[PDB]
Design a binder for this molecule. Structure first.
Ligand code: KAI
Ligand code: KAI
Ligand code: CL
Ligand code: CS
Ligand code: CS
Ligand code: CS
Ligand code: CS
Ligand code: CS
Ligand code: CS
Ligand code: CS
Ligand code: CS
Ligand code: CS
Ligand code: CS
Ligand code: CS
Ligand code: CS
Ligand code: CS
Lengths: 254, 254
């Protein structure tokens, strides 16, 4: 059987390969998520067809409760699997199925080395350093929904001034941190990838929560549980950690 | 109708409450897993009867391949849920359904403070300091099945003299660490709890793998997905973190 896999460009999970000529089909892509998909397909014995989500989004709900992104692709049975850094969340888990996590992480803070900022409360209690998150992502949703005082304060700040503190995507966020006085609230695995490559940046504080990425399937799909068992096998064999080290490790920080 | 919940005594997850009279029913018990069970039952709206697993085991396979412990209670439909620090593993996930994790953790090392030992490699390359794990637990299985060179060596040591380096339970392991030249390979969440209470002990190195604890249900359970959603809600609200802080915090160490 050939499975249709929805995905999205996101370093280092899914990237365009480098080549002298135009590329076609699955050969267009490489990354952690392509390696994962390869291992899963060998364990479970399926073939696969990788398609970028047409609207370029992960999956959030609008005011009318309608979904977009890779989540909507699954709800509508336009894909068999979503393989991406798709955060397992309460709201998504109500409308699609996820495997157990293939990576665990938490929200943390990307900012410059060598400053007095130590934690999110240090950001919450001031207004000179701007801070925000990718608009409509699981990090933003976390803050919008929080009832913890510090995070309520932070949400009030991020959402002020027509959400001027938010960014459209992680790359925009990375550039804003590098150039201006701005902190990005970012999933810790992406932070690790960034700070391997930008020696002037650092994670600030630890993880403010705990969550995972999981393979998405339509609700009621039989592949959800097979993929879970396959992920646990890869985890216990040390394969997922080897895959992470392959794609994360940078060129060293002087 | 009332759900039967299998569990096991294990500090600080499930413990006998302290009282001046004999205790009965759910009132016998307190701890992280009792708080979790309460929260789950309020979200999902069920009543429950907590029942200690009769053989006092978590769940492992005998040579015939028949299961025991909480895992077997679920297989046999003698319990509806298992709420305990029941590690989510490849072998278990084949025979029962686990919620998504309510806690994430890894194997690490419990040892004495003040020594030059820094990692599992340091242990593996020597014979003066003994080391082991709880017999037939998920940590022992990790070493038993590892194809990583260092962990193969460590397993060879752990299995000599008919497994004399292994212990029957965590308290025996802790007492051996306190009294003799011995390090215990232990789940990091249990190391955190021990080292807040025994000031001469410390965790050595970081986590050598990654995994979670989940709520166990029989394969096919109408509650598995409902419980996963409730866990996600409790995580996102900061309630699991608060519960961990309540039960882990000690006031005596350094
Ligand atoms: C790359 C981004 C936009 C994705 C990745 N996982 C989160 C998601 O699945 O919503 C988003 C990041 C975030 O919200 O910090
Ligand atoms: C307390 C012990 C016997 C349990 C706890 N979780 C692991 C399990 O579920 O197998 C075991 C610990 C270990 O093997 O380090
Ligand atoms: Cl699951
Ligand atoms: Cs090219
Ligand atoms: Cs294949
Ligand atoms: Cs679901
Ligand atoms: Cs700092
Ligand atoms: Cs509050
Ligand atoms: Cs700069
Ligand atoms: Cs209840
Ligand atoms: Cs009861
Ligand atoms: Cs299962
Ligand atoms: Cs050393
Ligand atoms: Cs040390
Ligand atoms: Cs080997
Ligand atoms: Cs302490």
């Amino acid at each position: 059987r050939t499975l249709i896999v929805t995905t999205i460009l996101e370093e280092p999970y899914v990237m365009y390969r480098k080549s002298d000529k135009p590329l076609y089909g699955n050969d267009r892509f490489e990354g952690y998520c392509l390696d994962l998909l390869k291992e899963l397909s060998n364990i479970l014995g399926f073939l696969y067809d990788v398609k970028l989500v047409p609207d370029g989004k992960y999956g959030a709900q609008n005011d009318k409760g309608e979904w977009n992104g890779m989540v909507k692709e699954l709800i509508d049975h336009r894909a068999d699997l979503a393989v991406a850094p798709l955060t397992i969340t309460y709201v998504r888990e109500k409308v699609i199925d996820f495997s157990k996590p293939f990576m665990t992480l938490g929200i943390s803070i990307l900012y410059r080395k060598g400053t007095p900022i130590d934690s999110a409360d240090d950001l919450a209690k001031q207004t000179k350093i701007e801070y925000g998150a990718v608009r409509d992502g699981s990090t933003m949703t976390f803050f919008k929904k929080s009832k913890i005082s510090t995070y309520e304060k932070m949400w009030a700040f991020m959402s002020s001034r027509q959400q001027s503190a938010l960014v459209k995507n992680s790359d925009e966020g990375i550039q804003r941190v590098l150039t201006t006085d701005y902190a990005l609230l970012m999933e810790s695995t992406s932070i690790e990838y960034v700070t391997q490559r930008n020696c002037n940046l650092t994670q600030i504080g630890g993880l403010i929560d705990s969550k995972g990425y999981g393979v998405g399937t339509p609700i009621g799909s039989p592949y959800r549980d097979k993929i879970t068992i396959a992920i646990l096998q890869l985890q216990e064999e040390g394969k997922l950690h080897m895959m992470k080290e392959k794609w994360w490790r940078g060129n060293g920080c002087p």
